[PDB]
């Protein structure tokens, strides 16, 4: 069982300690008790100088709050502080002192006659493995739910213009490129 | 009879849907899965069972 | 039969225990009794540190809450 604990301060030496309480305590006349018998910290399975820094305790056996400790809340490679990265699909996240859960990212559903418009929030590389400078925009065509990389700002879904033998689509080039059939387009060209 | 456990949640009760011969039932993949015929279905894809 | 139980605390050693009650209990003067005699748990057939975790018990012979 967990029982309780008490804090005992030596009025002579000023040293403070914790006494766990399945036992019955009898204090010396120089000792003072700072706290009445109170319960241990008891983290249930999968719940959601040691305190100069920060510590997160997971499913431990019942433990007392030692003097100088506080209940502040009810890697394979060298991650540099300020770096950002994306966590895996729905599951349980194990927290750390160095890592911040900045936001929760909802994947966007893309159907067959759609594409998703993305923008590089800072210089990055796309999922195809190509460079994207700041403010550059591009389209992703893979069907299903698309999960954007940390630096890919999602804008909107672009649906395909369905052609018929009674219609054609009139386009202008915003910049130079090679088009959907590989034809080289100059800026302000129309077809 | 379902016999309970500490690890497992009974989230919901699922009613089966009746399909007659000149009908089919329309389904959507709520996340990526495989159908009962054994074929992949990406998120938001829809199909018919007969 | 199930009878009942009582909870007995030693005021000296601070240990608490359970006494199941077809017996008459006569307490030693260091002991206190926390509860009047109350029924076992009695799960009927096919109804539908042991509690730091969680446990669900099926169709047991009558048992006290330790």
CA distance C56 to chain A (A): 16
**Beta strand ranges found along chain B (DSSP E):** 25-28, 33-34, 40-41, 46-49
Which candidate, A138, A142, A146, A157, places its Cα nearest to that of A107? A146
CA C47 to chain centre: 22
The Cα A149–Cα A126 span in angstroms is 8
Question: Token digits for B21?
Answer: 């011969």
The Cα C30–Cα C9 span in angstroms is 9
Cβ contact (<8 Å) for B45 and A143?
yes
Point out which residues pair with A183 in neighbouring strands.
none
C-alpha dihedral over C22, C26, C32, C38, to 10 degrees? 20
Contact predicate A25/A31, CB 8 Å: no
Question: Token digits for A71?
Answer: 């209940």
Interface residue ranges in chain C relative to chain B, Cβ cutoff 8 Å: 46, 48, 53-56, 58
Instruction: Give the other-Cβ count within 10 Å of A159's Cβ.
Output: 9
Contact predicate A44/A2, CB 8 Å: no
CA A103 to chain centre: 6
Cβ contact (<8 Å) for B6 and C46?
no
First to last CA, chain A: 80
Which residues of chain B does C54 touch, with a Cβ-Cβ cutoff of 8 Å? 6
Burial degree of B36 (CB within 10 A; 0-12, 13-18, 19+): exposed
Question: Token digits for A111?
Answer: 């159907």
Cβ contact (<8 Å) for B1 and C46?
yes
């Amino acid at each position: 069982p967990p029982y309780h604990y008490i804090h005992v301060l030596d009025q002579n030496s000023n040293v403070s300690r914790v006494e766990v309480g399945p036992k019955t305590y009898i204090r010396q006349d120089n000792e003072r008790v700072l706290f009445a018998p109170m319960r241990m910290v008891t983290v249930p399975p999968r719940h959601y100088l040691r305190h100069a820094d920060l510590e997160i305790r997971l499913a431990q056996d019942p433990f007392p709050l030692y003097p100088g400790e506080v209940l502040e809340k009810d890697d394979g490679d060298k991650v540099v502080a300020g770096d950002e990265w994306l966590f895996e699909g729905p599951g349980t996240y194990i927290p750390r002192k160095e890592v911040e859960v900045v936001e929760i990212i909802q994947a966007t559903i893309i159907r067959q006659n759609q594409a998703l418009r993305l923008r590089a929030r800072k210089e990055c590389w796309d999922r195809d493995g190509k460079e994207r400078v700041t403010g550059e925009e591009w389209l992703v065509t893979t069907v299903g739910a698309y999960l954007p990389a940390v630096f890919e700002e999602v804008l909107d879904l672009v649906d395909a213009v369905i052609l018929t033998e009674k219609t054609a689509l009139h386009l202008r080039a915003r910049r130079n490129f090679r088009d959907f059939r590989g034809v080289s387009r100059r800026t302000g060209e129309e077809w």
